Design a protein around this ligand. Sequence first.
Ligand SMILES: *[C@@H]1O[C@H](CO)[C@@H](O[C@@H]2O[C@H](CO)[C@@H](O)[C@H](O)[C@H]2NC(C)=O)[C@H](O)[C@H]1NC(C)=O
Lengths: 214, 217
Amino acid sequence: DIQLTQSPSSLSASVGDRVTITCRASQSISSYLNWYQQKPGKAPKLLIYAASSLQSGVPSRFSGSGSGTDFTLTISSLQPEDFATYYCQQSYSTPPYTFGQGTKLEIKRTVAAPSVFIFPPSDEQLKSGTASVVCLLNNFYPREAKVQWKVDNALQSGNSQESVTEQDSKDSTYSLSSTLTLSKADYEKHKVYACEVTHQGLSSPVTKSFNRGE
Amino acid sequence: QVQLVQSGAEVKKPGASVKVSCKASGYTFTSYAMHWVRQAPGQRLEWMGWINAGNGNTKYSQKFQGRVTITRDTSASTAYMELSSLRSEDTAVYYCAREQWLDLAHFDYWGQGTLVTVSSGSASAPTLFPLVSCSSVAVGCLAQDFLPDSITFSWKYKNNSDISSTRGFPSVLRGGKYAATSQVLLPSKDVMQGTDEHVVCKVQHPNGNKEKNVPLP
Ligand SMILES: *[C@@H]1O[C@H](CO)[C@@H](O[C@@H]2O[C@H](CO)[C@@H](O)[C@H](O)[C@H]2NC(C)=O)[C@H](O)[C@H]1NC(C)=O
């Protein structure tokens, strides 16, 4: 089977930068290489076929070159909406129709600190027997952020989940939602609920909190 | 405008089978082969098989041989993929894709995808809870206890006009069911200087659409 290895696996770059991604095939595939783009929650989209042919409708900043075992996809002027995973794929010797493991491209931009909001559980939820406490971090860059839940100043562990949006198509920032899940009883055994956020754009951690009463 | 439109999300138990459809339009259906490619969440694209839309000939990946069937209805311009003996590792988004043969083969058009979820649990619609804070004010919506993970949020004012949506957050899995949050950011001064006391969060889900009034502080 022909294996495809993409390099790098991850890459951050600035708007306007020239970006180059490489795909190496375990054996010669002539020009039977295609490049696809895939954004979160969407289907792949053809960018390049036959190593260097631009698919109709694709912006001209995408180009490809190579033949044999080494191929390159180049974005000559990176745009904010180019955040995505890029796959190479060979159609010379099949099956299998081999895809690369993908190269994830993020847009590099200036540091932006998150704005933080905390939301207590609703009464309607509490009567169900479970309490969800939500903490939102909005419009920050880079993606790396730390959320620490605290209940009466006791650091929580193992009882929270979180997820991060895709990179915004205009301003290239992220948002993150974190949920701390307690039982109604445990929730009513404590008073102060807080999320503490650590991020490069903050000189010191930022804490948002409430008291179970109000 | 070449278009490939696939059937909706599916929830199945381990051991069951699933059949996904892919309706083609904008070209001569019989002139192009149709391939099926799946992607487990966060994973690699994985080719499964192709069918020649003209003469109905097929070829399958040896990984799926014996449990996958690809068919086509020419008069309906539709291709079908059936996968049996489903296991949890079959949970994935399944895509149909058209192959362009001209020059060097390549997949030039893709369907929007079909989420197939294999679970011991059962499908369920979401339950909505408001997120109220205790410059812009943040208002939110929590959808819980829904399956499959195929949900979309939208927001409306009291006067029934749309609120500009913000980046959606991925759902998280807990106890065999999914949960997701959504948020809108409203100017603070327009909220405190306003007669409206709530907005409306709406969710669309294959098992039941829901609405919830979200108070404003
Ligand atoms: C629908 O009602 C909302 C709430 O009163 C209105 O939202 C305001 O719209 C103005 C438009 O200039 C904005 O400046 C305010 O920030 C909005 N307020 C909030 C709280 O979002 C909206 O104008 C109304 N639309 C119609 C067609 O009546």
